[PDB]
């Protein structure tokens, strides 16, 4: 199936900047969530999980249809906790009922990265809601207890290469693992609601010990109180991933640029943009607007 981007009728960059801004203002206001981490990280994860169901082989799943709104997908065990991002976005959608679900979930992620001082992420509109029977089955999102070979093969289905995978994984600077959600517990670093290359620095520089958590799963833990999932740690076990980890640990701008590209790509897999579609939008942050 072909999913052609269709601009919400009559809307232009200013309309979407208003949605951006409303997301960004609520991110600022609703600051208590998750022990004052705030909603930035879970909005980034929501954008990724609503996009990461894509299968390049038949164009099923992906961000276009906004299918997370249907119970099969919002109740995927892999999506445990993302209901908090959805509830956050609900008043946004009520204020701007014209935006499609896929456009709102993906825009939430863009807005979160940027408001957390991350790179600009160009964003295109035009996702169109598709019906309940287009919701992908559970099981397309990745397991965390696996090795580098798993990770590499997993991400081929999303048409991501080694550099794109290592870049995307840098989002694990943000937020934390929650035992009751995923069976893993702990943050990956100190700056977990500011977008930086800390994930790579911690991988290389902390002294990691392989421990079992209280759900009886293995994870890597440091004396600083940080953790890494087995799939995170695989990025320094595999020599190809390791090289790229070192690159991003040593060049913040390069990480920003590569993350931006990969994240836009993730959010756009499966969508065909007509030749005369609008160019991608780059939203101003609240700070850049003086708001
Ligand atoms: C091999 C791939 C990946 C695996 C196995 C994985 C696994 C996980 C797990 C188990 C959690 C913790 C969930 C919880 O307990 O709350 C998590 C959190 C998170 N992941 Fe991933 N992840 C992967 C890739 C990504 C990518 C590609 C992104 C986005 C670019 C991403 C963004 C996040 C964020 C932002 C959080 C924190 C959420 C929060 O604090 O609520 N992850 N991930």
> Largest Cα–Cα distance of the chain, in whole Å?
55
Domain co-membership, 242 together with 258: yes
How many CB atoms sit inside 10 A of residue 176's CB? 19
Ligand 1 centre to CA of 9 (Å) is 34
Ligand 1 centre to CA of 11 (Å) is 32
What CA–CA distances, in Å, run from 245 to 147, 162, 169, 185, 224? 16, 10, 10, 23, 20
Question: Which runs of consecutive H residues, i.e. helices, occur in the chain?
Answer: 13-29, 33-36, 40-51, 71-74, 83-95, 101-115, 148-156, 162-169, 179-182, 198-205, 230-237, 239-249, 252-268, 286-289
Q: Which residues line ligand 1 (CB under 6 A)?
A: 41-42, 44-45, 48, 81, 142, 144, 151, 168-169, 171-172, 174-178, 181-182, 184, 229, 231, 263
Domain co-membership, 136 together with 272: yes
Q: Which residues fall within 8 angstroms of residue 66, CB to CB, at 6 or more apart?
A: 50, 100, 101, 102, 103, 104, 105, 127, 129, 130
Quote the CA–CA distance of 27 and 241 in Å, as a whole number.
33
Domain co-membership, 65 together with 159: no
Domain co-membership, 52 together with 157: no
Atom of ligand 1 at shortest range from CA of 181: 15
Indicate if 49 belongs to the active site. Answer: yes
Give me 167's structure tokens.
């870049």
Domain co-membership, 136 together with 221: no
Domain CATH for 27: 1.10.520.10
Atom of ligand 1 at shortest range from CA of 142: 5
How many CB atoms sit inside 10 A of residue 71's CB? 10
What CA–CA distances, in Å, run from 160 to 29, 52, 130, 135? 35, 11, 25, 22
Stated in angstroms to one decimal place, the resolution of this structure is 1.4
Quote the CA–CA distance of 232 and 187 in Å, as a whole number.
12
290 contacts 75 by C-beta, under 8 angstroms: no
Ligand 1 centre to CA of 19 (Å) is 25
User: Does 3 count as an annotated binding residue?
Assistant: no
Selection from 105, 66, 67, 107 nearest residue 86 by Cα: 105
Set 123, 188, 208, 220: catalytic member: 188
Domain co-membership, 37 together with 147: no
Atom of ligand 1 at shortest range from CA of 174: 35
Domain co-membership, 137 together with 269: yes
Indicate if 54 belongs to the active site. Answer: no
Ligand 1 centre to CA of 114 (Å) is 18
Domain co-membership, 149 together with 126: no
215: three-class secondary structure by DSSP: coil
236 contacts 169 by C-beta, under 8 angstroms: no
Number of domain units in the chain: 2
Ligand 1 centre to CA of 36 (Å) is 18
Domain CATH for 239: 1.10.420.10
136 contacts 67 by C-beta, under 8 angstroms: yes
184: three-class secondary structure by DSSP: coil
Q: Which residues fall within 8 angstroms of residue 79, CB to CB, at 6 or more apart?
A: 49, 68, 73, 141
135 contacts 129 by C-beta, under 8 angstroms: no
Write out the residue range of the structural domain in which residue 169 sits. Answer: 142-262
Domain co-membership, 106 together with 76: yes
User: Candidates 169, 178, 188, 235: which one to mutate for ligand 1, based on the most atoms within 8 Å of Cβ?
Assistant: 169
Give me 11's structure tokens.
């809307």
Domain co-membership, 257 together with 267: no
Selection from 207, 8, 9 nearest residue 107 by Cα: 8
Q: Which residues fall within 8 angstroms of residue 24, CB to CB, at 6 or more apart?
A: 111, 114, 115, 285, 286, 291
Domain co-membership, 110 together with 3: yes
CA nearest ligand 1 atom 18, residue? 177
Domain co-membership, 160 together with 252: yes
CA nearest ligand 1 atom 8, residue? 144
Set 3, 48, 49, 220: catalytic member: 49
């Amino acid at each position: 199936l072909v999913h052609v981007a269709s601009v919400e009728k009559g809307r232009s960059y200013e309309d979407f900047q208003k949605v951006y801004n409303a997301i960004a203002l609520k991110l600022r206001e609703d600051d208590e969530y998750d022990n004052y981490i705030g909603y930035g990280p879970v909005l980034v994860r929501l954008a990724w999980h609503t996009s990461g169901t894509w299968d390049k082989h038949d164009n099923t799943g992906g961000s276009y249809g906004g299918t997370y709104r249907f119970k099969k997908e919002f109740n995927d065990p892999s999506n445990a906790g993302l209901q908090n991002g959805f509830k956050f976005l609900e008043p946004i959608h009520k204020e701007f009922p014209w935006i499609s679900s896929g456009d709102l979930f993906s825009l939430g992620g863009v807005t979160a990265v940027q408001e957390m001082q991350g790179p600009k992420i160009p964003w295109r509109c035009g996702r169109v809601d598709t019906p309940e029977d287009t919701t992908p089955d559970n099981g397309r999102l990745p397991d965390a207890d696996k090795d580098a070979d798993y990770v590499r093969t997993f991400f081929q289905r999303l048409n991501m290469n080694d550099r794109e995978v290592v870049a995307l994984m840098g989002a694990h600077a943000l937020g934390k693992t929650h035992l009751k959600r995923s069976g893993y517990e702990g943050p990956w670093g100190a700056a977990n609601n500011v977008f930086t290359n800390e994930f790579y620095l911690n991988l290389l520089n902390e002294d990691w010990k392989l421990e079992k958590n209280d759900a009886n799963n293995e994870q890597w833990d440091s004396k600083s109180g940080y953790m890494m999932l087995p799939t995170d740690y695989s990025l320094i076990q595999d020599p190809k991933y390791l090289s790229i980890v070192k690159e991003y640990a040593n060049d913040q701008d390069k990480f920003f640029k590569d993350f931006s590209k990969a994240f836009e790509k993730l959010l756009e897999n499966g969508i065909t943009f007509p030749k005369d579609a609008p160019s991608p939008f780059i939203f101003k942050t609240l700070e850049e607007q003086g708001l």
